[PDB]
Amino acid sequence: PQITLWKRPLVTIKIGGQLKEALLDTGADDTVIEEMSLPGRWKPKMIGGIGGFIKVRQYDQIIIEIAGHKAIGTVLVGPTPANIIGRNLLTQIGATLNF
Amino acid sequence: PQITLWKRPLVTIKIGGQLKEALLDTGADDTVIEEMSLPGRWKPKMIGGIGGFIKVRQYDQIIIEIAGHKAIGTVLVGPTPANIIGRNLLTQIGATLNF
Numbered sequence: 001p002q003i004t005l006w007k008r009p010l011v012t013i014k015i016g017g018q019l020k021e022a023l024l025d026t027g028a029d030d031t032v033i034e035e036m037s038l039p040g041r042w043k044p045k046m047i048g049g050i051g052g053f054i055k056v057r058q059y060d061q062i063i064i065e066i067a068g069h070k071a072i073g074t075v076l077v078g079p080t081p082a083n084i085i086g087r088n089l090l091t092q093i094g095a096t097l098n099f
Numbered sequence: 100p101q102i103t104l105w106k107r108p109l110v111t112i113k114i115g116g117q118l119k120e121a122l123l124d125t126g127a128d129d130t131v132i133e134e135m136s137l138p139g140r141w142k143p144k145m146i147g148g149i150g151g152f153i154k155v156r157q158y159d160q161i162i163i164e165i166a167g168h169k170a171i172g173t174v175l176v177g178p179t180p181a182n183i184i185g186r187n188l189l190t191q192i193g194a195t196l197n198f
């Protein structure tokens with residue numbers, strides 16, 4: 001598909017057995033998902049945005065479907081205002097920015 | 100060009116006649132540049148990211164070249180951790196996401 005940028009590039013994702021809407025984000029190194037009760041072990045992390053840092057839980061090898069494309073990788077969970085799909089997963093679904 | 104996402108999508112911009120590096124950022128509504136002297140009228144604004152909100156100077160109708168493509172639009176100048184080109188200017192240069 002092709003997604004224009006007139007509006008936020010939101011797509012449906014499936015993670016942890018739940019459907020969510022998430023932003024396809026070339027500016028994000030990492031994938032950050034709003035607080036949800038994912039099972040298993042995690043590692044503490046702090047990540048940096050425009051306004052400072054937030055505390056997140058780092059989960060590895062998380063199964064995650066993005067606009068119908070399967071992916072697996074690291075997902076950070078914590079108190080974000082948007083679910084964001086960053087480059088660690090955008091590469092897995094073969095996304096490019098084109099102009 | 101077609102830009103893959105294994106690395107940060109950094110390009111050269113020209114703003115105020117000065118060359119800078121900036122991130123092509125589909126997750127950003129707005130374009131935010133580090134503190135600089137910039138010819139133009141500005142008004143105070145607040146914008147949010149992960150981590151919270153910051154104060155910026157909003158400059159409208161600024162000429163900016165992005166990877167050799169012309170845009171003229173709103174640039175926010177302030178203590179951003181990084182120079183980001185958001186959707187307001189990505190749309191001007193005809194950028195899309197593809198997968």
Ligand SMILES: CC(C)(C)NC(=O)[C@@H]1C[C@@H]2CCCC[C@@H]2CN1C[C@@H](O)[C@H](Cc1ccccc1)NC(=O)[C@H](CC(N)=O)NC(=O)c1ccc2ccccc2n1
Nearest residue numbers: 027030048049050081082126127128129146147148149180
């Ligand atoms: C997600 C994370 C891994 C932490 N990465 C980042 O946050 C990196 C950090 C980099 C260094 C600091 C400068 C910004 C760049 C790019 N960002 C990605 C970048 O795409 C980031 C992702 C994002 C989207 C929505 C909400 C929050 C955060 N967007 C932003 O920082 C832009 C800034 C702007 N235009 O005003 N924010 C928004 O466009 C935006 C939209 C909705 C919101 C609702 C509530 C609160 C804040 C909201 N911010």
